[PDB]
Point group: D2
């Protein structure tokens, strides 16, 4: 009757990313690069830093690239070796065998259904959920900051962020309680409220740490927000504000902004990129 | 007590070099015995045995095994546009999440492959099926084995008497008491030298193992693991009520295709007719 | 002046619905007869016939067909690491460029498929091979055909006598003069109705056509119906294969082909024959 | 006269090691410049220049390039089910047969790559486009080049290391960094076959008109990360729906 550690994270990667066509008509959206790494790469790096040791990808149909990316690139590594090029550039692209599991979603039925797909791999253990479109820039990574708070309050946690009024109908909204620094009690939550019925402004961001009871609730109704809801009254539920900036690579403008931000932070790229940005701006 | 099954591991990361050039760019596990691939048969067998979580330990060029168990979108659409029943595909798709894939990364054998499923299995007994061992019969091999499991528990493996000159190719069992279909395993040696075989009953690619076996594998990180397990838990060999075809070998693959074909009402007539002629 | 033969078209975009579930996610052209995929036998055949440009018109889920004819990097490296000879793969890789692929995009049949190779063929004669028609024998179907082509020229197709209740499934030929292995085609109808068959010699998946046939296909923007318009002005003969053909298009044929080849293999025949008789009563 | 020009060769078999780990399992030719992958821009450029036959010489892990130019069955179905227009995909797929693929098999460089298309091109003039060289401008590099072709014929290359002679405005008889845009005569194929590299186009200077064309626009070397980012920023600033937010961010982020 103990409580297990969270050595697990679930990555919903079965979307058709229709917003980025034509680029995504044959390329997984999750594979779009922020400078030189694909969105999922950042996401799993984040998880590793947070101490997670079992990544479980719930995929779709045309996404083999996601699978190959985290395996040995046999010919590539051979080619590089034949050129004295170091494989350090691939550090972190491959985990221990078994640490990355895949399960097909089969039918595109949303986030809750997706998480539900991992039910048997998670078991009676708390688990994390990361939506790669939410590029979280900062140190430590969002998940690590979150796990840090988990270690002290336990229960369920989600990344929270103040959003403009005309933006509230696009996210799940939190009904805030007591604030204790970075944490803030969630007294309620509604998935995309109507534009006049927003309980507040702090929305839910694609970073979660949930207790196994949430899986159970999903199996039973067998969606997510409504499932976390059912667990306000009996388990610690807090919103965590990220010490860094988040870029919504879900929309083209964010994607570009993220690329720029990261490039400006790179020793070898900022000089050239800065110089160019400057002129190009008038 | 005897913890219930429901989890099966399928090692499918081999390069099947024996079937080249057929397996040069296609998974050996996908070779058809008439009209269904070897894994399909193995999965069906698991389903019948009450297993509800398939764990595939794959290799690099094997996306076909993945697509085979998902919805074939365009195909199903084209069949519907021709009033063709999709019943032909029943059993091809399981519930979302019931089939998990993990990459073996490096081909280091059976033990290593099974080891790759450690976190998915957990504490929990698990089954292991090698699709190359085509098990023809009813009920299926795994079902017959699980029936014996719910009675004796512990670890079980499929056993089969093999000719003398063939013993050096299998793991051999040192038999104890026989109770109908079961036979106690008092010891086992992987591929003994010819003249050194303790007996003739070898190990076949069908296993039901206790979680302590995974533990022993993580620790040594193969056949040698099952054995640090004889004085502690009931360990029996099960004889299959049916015939097994070694599709690991060219001749076996063909024999299997012939056998199944002859059991098919719509194929038997034509096949038998030809077989006879062609034989002289 | 007979245009030399140097190109072959392989229609490999079918969904092989007949072999489900085996063909649910695997190209039917990759089904093996003992050792080698159907398409491998087909290209072998073309190579023997002196063809040096294979042109595959494929579909959507058929990357295996493309990988099969390229270097299998990891595999060849692993075999080398085990002193295993790569001879087993001889013929699986041709010279760079000798195999071209074009996507059919939509499954509109054989004529459409061949039409897709129009700009690759151009103004030159071309062959057409349907891998489902496993041609067992030697020299080998295309070779035997090209031998006849080199003396008669024009257009040729493999012809085979088929049972009466089987005629409605093939294109049927109206035979003329027979000159040994050849037989003039005076006409042909695609799948005639049962009772309407002009004869019994059907068209088999092996063709040698003149560029004018492409022209006619481009204009009509089907196959059978186009070869027709080429009767009164280009030598058109049907060729009989010196060997046996297996219709791997249907399950029984696939099985039969596998058994036939197996029995011709010194290393497999003993075990296979022994089994065959026992399991047969 | 001058044999028109209806064929283009696209060398797309590189391992893009410079963009690791992004290109570990994804073709570098598929890297997006905001909305579309590099090859898309390249083929669009070709179509605008009147090219009717695209020939891709690919490598091993590059199925994405093939699927991209075919019908995305399930996707188009899903969009339809959402009343979303497919115009977003216009230019994504050409007439069947207009895109041919040949495997390079062995990574032996540009010359060998072009050589692989020898039998598809035949005795005809052909273009060559390296998608890493993102050519931003209107009417687009190949078009501008083809315009000069119909006048002078022979062989042309995009210029921006070469020594010149006479400058006829945009043309200049052969700095001038050579750029990945070529229009070559069939005799160059023959010379490649024989020695069986590119600087063998030179064995073609005393017999055919050979000029360098200067591009009316700017080129971004998406071969290196700085260039890739610059290209994405430039295009974004040119898009009415993205420029506002992108510019506002850029400014703030720059200090
Ligand atoms: O992004 P989705 O899938 O449209 O919506 C999901 O993630 C959002 C954050 O990105 C949350 O605010 C929503 O509550 C959640 O349902
Ligand atoms: O097939 P392998 O790898 O030579 O040997 C493996 O499968 C055999 C059955 O096929 C088992 O009897 C062996 O114990 C196992 O190690
Ligand atoms: O096989 P298909 O495409 O159904 O039909 C095609 O090949 C047959 C032989 O296999 C010929 O008899 C038909 O005339 C030809 O159109
Ligand atoms: O990559 P290569 O073949 O060494 O060089 C090639 O690509 C370069 C861009 O990457 C171009 O600037 C060169 O003109 C072209 O020949």
């Amino acid at each position: 009757m103990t409580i297990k550690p969270l050595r697990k994270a679930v990555f919903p990667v079965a979307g058709l990313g229709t917003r980025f066509l034509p680029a995504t008509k044959a390329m997984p959206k999750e594979m779009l690069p922020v400078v030189d790494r694909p969105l999922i790469q950042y996401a799993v790096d984040e998880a590793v830093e947070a101490g997670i040791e079992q990544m479980i990808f719930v995929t779709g149909r045309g996404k083999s690239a996601l699978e190959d990316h985290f395996d040995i690139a046999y010919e590539l590594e051979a080619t590089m070796a034949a050129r004295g090029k170091s494989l350090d550039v691939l550090d972190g692209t491959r985990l221990k065998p078994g640490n990355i599991a895949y399960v097909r979603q089969q039918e595109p039925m949303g986030l809750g259904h997706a998480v539900w797909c991992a039910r048997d791999i998670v078991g009676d253990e708390p688990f994390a959920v990361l939506l790669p479109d939410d590029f979280m820039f900062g140190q430590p990574g969002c998940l690590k900051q979150m796990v840090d708070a988990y270690n002290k309050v336990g229960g369920n946690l989600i990344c929270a962020e103040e959003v403009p009024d005309d933006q509230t109908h696009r996210y799940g909204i939190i009904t805030p309680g007591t604030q204790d620094g970075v944490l803030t009690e969630v007294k309620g939550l509604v998935e995309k409220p109507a534009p006049g019925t927003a309980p507040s402004n702090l929305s839910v961001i694609g970073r979660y740490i949930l207790q196994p009871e949430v899986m159970r609730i999903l199996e039973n109704q067998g969606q997510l927000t409504d499932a976390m809801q059912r667990m306000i009254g009996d388990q610690p539920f807090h919103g965590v504000t990220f010490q860094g900036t988040r870029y919504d690579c879900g929309d083209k403008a964010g994607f570009i902004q993220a690329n720029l931000a990261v490039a400006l932070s790179r020793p070898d790229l900022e000089p050239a990129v800065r110089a160019f940005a400057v002129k190009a701006l008038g």
